[PDB]
Design an enzyme around this catalytic site. Structure first.
Site, PDB file in Angstrom:
ATOM      1  N   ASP A 100      -0.696   5.000   3.713  1.00 35.27           N
ATOM      2  CA  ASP A 100      -1.037   4.078   2.683  1.00 35.27           C
ATOM      3  C   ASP A 100      -0.013   4.058   1.552  1.00 35.27           C
ATOM      4  O   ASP A 100       0.484   2.981   1.245  1.00 35.27           O
ATOM      5  CB  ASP A 100      -2.437   4.373   2.142  1.00 35.27           C
ATOM      6  CG  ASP A 100      -3.513   4.316   3.214  1.00 35.27           C
ATOM      7  OD1 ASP A 100      -3.484   3.348   4.003  1.00 35.27           O
ATOM      8  OD2 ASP A 100      -4.344   5.247   3.240  1.00 35.27           O
ATOM      9  N   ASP A 139      13.661  -3.978  -1.539  1.00 34.73           N
ATOM     10  CA  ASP A 139      12.429  -4.658  -1.921  1.00 34.73           C
ATOM     11  C   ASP A 139      12.620  -5.759  -2.954  1.00 34.73           C
ATOM     12  O   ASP A 139      11.611  -6.253  -3.486  1.00 34.73           O
ATOM     13  CB  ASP A 139      11.359  -3.685  -2.384  1.00 34.73           C
ATOM     14  CG  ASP A 139      11.729  -2.852  -3.587  1.00 34.73           C
ATOM     15  OD1 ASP A 139      10.959  -1.912  -3.869  1.00 34.73           O
ATOM     16  OD2 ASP A 139      12.763  -3.127  -4.233  1.00 34.73           O
ATOM     17  N   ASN A 177      18.434   6.087 -16.986  1.00 37.08           N
ATOM     18  CA  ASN A 177      17.571   5.596 -18.050  1.00 37.08           C
ATOM     19  C   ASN A 177      17.044   4.210 -17.737  1.00 37.08           C
ATOM     20  O   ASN A 177      16.972   3.824 -16.560  1.00 37.08           O
ATOM     21  CB  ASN A 177      18.275   5.744 -19.392  1.00 37.08           C
ATOM     22  CG  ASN A 177      18.535   7.200 -19.721  1.00 37.08           C
ATOM     23  OD1 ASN A 177      17.600   7.975 -19.833  1.00 37.08           O
ATOM     24  ND2 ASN A 177      19.790   7.604 -19.802  1.00 37.08           N
ATOM     25  N   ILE A 194      14.655   1.494 -16.420  1.00 37.41           N
ATOM     26  CA  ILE A 194      13.547   1.568 -15.485  1.00 37.41           C
ATOM     27  C   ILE A 194      13.592   2.921 -14.767  1.00 37.41           C
ATOM     28  O   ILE A 194      14.624   3.318 -14.232  1.00 37.41           O
ATOM     29  CB  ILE A 194      13.626   0.437 -14.440  1.00 37.41           C
ATOM     30  CG1 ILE A 194      13.694  -0.972 -15.017  1.00 37.41           C
ATOM     31  CG2 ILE A 194      12.461   0.564 -13.453  1.00 37.41           C
ATOM     32  CD1 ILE A 194      14.147  -2.044 -14.034  1.00 37.41           C
ATOM     33  N   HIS A 238       8.831   2.335 -10.065  1.00 38.48           N
ATOM     34  CA  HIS A 238       7.902   1.204  -9.990  1.00 38.48           C
ATOM     35  C   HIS A 238       6.941   1.396  -8.832  1.00 38.48           C
ATOM     36  O   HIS A 238       7.230   2.205  -7.942  1.00 38.48           O
ATOM     37  CB  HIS A 238       8.674  -0.105  -9.940  1.00 38.48           C
ATOM     38  CG  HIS A 238       9.595  -0.335  -8.799  1.00 38.48           C
ATOM     39  ND1 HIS A 238      10.783  -0.999  -8.973  1.00 38.48           N
ATOM     40  CD2 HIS A 238       9.564  -0.043  -7.478  1.00 38.48           C
ATOM     41  CE1 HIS A 238      11.404  -1.131  -7.814  1.00 38.48           C
ATOM     42  NE2 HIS A 238      10.694  -0.514  -6.871  1.00 38.48           N
ATOM     43  N   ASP A 247       2.938   1.378  -2.489  1.00 35.45           N
ATOM     44  CA  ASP A 247       4.060   2.301  -2.445  1.00 35.45           C
ATOM     45  C   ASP A 247       4.689   2.491  -3.821  1.00 35.45           C
ATOM     46  O   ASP A 247       4.614   1.615  -4.675  1.00 35.45           O
ATOM     47  CB  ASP A 247       5.096   1.787  -1.438  1.00 35.45           C
ATOM     48  CG  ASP A 247       4.645   1.846   0.006  1.00 35.45           C
ATOM     49  OD1 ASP A 247       3.469   2.156   0.332  1.00 35.45           O
ATOM     50  OD2 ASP A 247       5.494   1.532   0.874  1.00 35.45           O
ATOM     51  N   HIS A 250       8.198   3.917  -5.870  1.00 32.62           N
ATOM     52  CA  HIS A 250       9.626   4.234  -5.769  1.00 32.62           C
ATOM     53  C   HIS A 250      10.096   4.806  -7.106  1.00 32.62           C
ATOM     54  O   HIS A 250       9.733   4.315  -8.157  1.00 32.62           O
ATOM     55  CB  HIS A 250      10.438   2.985  -5.406  1.00 32.62           C
ATOM     56  CG  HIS A 250      10.012   2.325  -4.136  1.00 32.62           C
ATOM     57  ND1 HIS A 250      10.340   1.004  -3.867  1.00 32.62           N
ATOM     58  CD2 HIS A 250       9.361   2.778  -3.037  1.00 32.62           C
ATOM     59  CE1 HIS A 250       9.897   0.689  -2.671  1.00 32.62           C
ATOM     60  NE2 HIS A 250       9.264   1.741  -2.143  1.00 32.62           N
ATOM     61  N   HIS A 290       1.618   7.888 -13.760  1.00 33.84           N
ATOM     62  CA  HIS A 290       1.630   6.498 -14.212  1.00 33.84           C
ATOM     63  C   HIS A 290       1.785   5.558 -13.018  1.00 33.84           C
ATOM     64  O   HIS A 290       1.041   4.574 -12.901  1.00 33.84           O
ATOM     65  CB  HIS A 290       2.721   6.279 -15.266  1.00 33.84           C
ATOM     66  CG  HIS A 290       2.924   4.863 -15.699  1.00 33.84           C
ATOM     67  ND1 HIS A 290       2.434   4.355 -16.879  1.00 33.84           N
ATOM     68  CD2 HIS A 290       3.597   3.827 -15.147  1.00 33.84           C
ATOM     69  CE1 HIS A 290       2.774   3.086 -17.032  1.00 33.84           C
ATOM     70  NE2 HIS A 290       3.491   2.742 -15.989  1.00 33.84           N
ATOM     71  N   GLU A 291       2.805   5.760 -12.183  1.00 36.92           N
ATOM     72  CA  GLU A 291       3.004   4.812 -11.085  1.00 36.92           C
ATOM     73  C   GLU A 291       1.785   4.735 -10.186  1.00 36.92           C
ATOM     74  O   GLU A 291       1.434   3.681  -9.669  1.00 36.92           O
ATOM     75  CB  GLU A 291       4.252   5.160 -10.261  1.00 36.92           C
ATOM     76  CG  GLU A 291       5.522   5.130 -11.077  1.00 36.92           C
ATOM     77  CD  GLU A 291       5.749   3.872 -11.886  1.00 36.92           C
ATOM     78  OE1 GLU A 291       5.373   2.781 -11.412  1.00 36.92           O
ATOM     79  OE2 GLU A 291       6.393   3.913 -12.963  1.00 36.92           O
ATOM     80  N   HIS A 304      -0.740   2.247 -10.989  1.00 37.73           N
ATOM     81  CA  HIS A 304      -0.420   0.928 -10.435  1.00 37.73           C
ATOM     82  C   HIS A 304      -0.761   0.853  -8.950  1.00 37.73           C
ATOM     83  O   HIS A 304      -1.284  -0.155  -8.444  1.00 37.73           O
ATOM     84  CB  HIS A 304       1.041   0.566 -10.665  1.00 37.73           C
ATOM     85  CG  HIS A 304       1.450   0.387 -12.092  1.00 37.73           C
ATOM     86  ND1 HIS A 304       0.744  -0.347 -13.005  1.00 37.73           N
ATOM     87  CD2 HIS A 304       2.578   0.783 -12.734  1.00 37.73           C
ATOM     88  CE1 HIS A 304       1.392  -0.349 -14.166  1.00 37.73           C
ATOM     89  NE2 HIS A 304       2.543   0.295 -14.010  1.00 37.73           N
ATOM     90  N   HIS A 336      -0.899  -2.220 -17.091  1.00 39.20           N
ATOM     91  CA  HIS A 336      -0.576  -1.550 -18.340  1.00 39.20           C
ATOM     92  C   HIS A 336      -1.699  -1.685 -19.362  1.00 39.20           C
ATOM     93  O   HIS A 336      -2.469  -2.638 -19.388  1.00 39.20           O
ATOM     94  CB  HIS A 336       0.744  -2.091 -18.924  1.00 39.20           C
ATOM     95  CG  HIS A 336       1.939  -1.596 -18.167  1.00 39.20           C
ATOM     96  ND1 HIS A 336       3.087  -2.312 -17.973  1.00 39.20           N
ATOM     97  CD2 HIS A 336       2.106  -0.442 -17.457  1.00 39.20           C
ATOM     98  CE1 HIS A 336       3.913  -1.610 -17.215  1.00 39.20           C
ATOM     99  NE2 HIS A 336       3.363  -0.457 -16.902  1.00 39.20           N
TER     100      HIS A 336
HETATM  101 CA   LIG Z   1      16.857   3.843 -14.223  1.00 36.25          CA
HETATM  102 CA   LIG Z   2       1.765   1.070   1.558  1.00 33.92          CA
HETATM  103 ZN   LIG Z   3      11.351  -0.374  -5.031  1.00 31.53          ZN
HETATM  104 ZN   LIG Z   4       3.937   0.846 -15.485  1.00 36.27          ZN
END
Ligand SMILES: [Ca+2]
Ligand SMILES: [Ca+2]
Ligand SMILES: [Zn+2]
Ligand SMILES: [Zn+2]
Length: 163
Positions: free
Chosen positions: A58, A70, A78, A80, A83, A94, A96, A118-119, A122, A128
């Site tokens: 999953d 993607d 630094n 991002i 995600h 998923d 990353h 945090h991720e 999501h 958020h």
């Molecule tokens: Ca970065």
């Molecule tokens: Ca998946």
């Molecule tokens: Zn990605």
């Molecule tokens: Zn976020």
């Protein structure tokens, strides 16, 4: 804050796989950060996360640089940090992580456990929050990790989706 369209998982026993690692932490330290990040959500919901070592899970977890298949490229050190995709089949769920970051298990930027926690919000269908004390606030902030517990706003958020 729940994602527009409220995507959610239909089962509550979800699997995950760590596909690759970061050289700045041991493999054990990455596995712990990830395990503990899932447990935060597990103790505030009916969700149960089960690790698998190979095959299709999953929630896939991986460290990637720049373009990584993607159409949402990472950006180097630094900016991002990571995600994650909303609940769904395939890429859905998923998470990353930007391979070019300094990943830590300390107060030094960037604590992997915090970012992964945090991720996964999501991954589970949270958006958020505007609450600067919430884990789901848009911007990273270090918080003590040795006995970390979900902030109340994030408990409210996962309970709104899953009970
Ligand atoms: Ca970065
Ligand atoms: Ca998946
Ligand atoms: Zn990605
Ligand atoms: Zn976020």
């Amino acid at each position: 804050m729940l994602t527009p369209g409220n995507p959610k998982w239909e089962r509550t026993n979800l699997t995950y796989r760590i596909r690759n690692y970061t050289p700045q932490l041991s493999e054990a330290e990455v596995e712990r950060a990830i395990k503990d990040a899932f447990e935060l959500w597990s103790v505030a919901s009916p969700l149960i996360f089960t690790r698998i070592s190979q095959g299709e899970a999953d929630i896939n977890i991986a460290f990637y640089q720049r373009d990584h298949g993607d159409n949402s490229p990472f950006d180097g050190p630094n900016g991002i940090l990571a995600h994650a995709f909303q609940p769904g089949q395939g890429i859905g769920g998923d998470a990353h992580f930007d391979a070019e970051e300094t990943w830590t298990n300390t107060s030094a930027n960037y604590n992997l456990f915090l970012v992964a926690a945090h991720e996964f919000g999501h991954s589970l269908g949270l958006a958020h929050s505007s609450d600067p004390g919430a884990l789901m606030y848009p911007n990273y902030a270090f918080r003590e990790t040795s006995n970390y517990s979900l902030p109340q706003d994030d408990i409210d958020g996962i309970q709104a989706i899953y009970g």
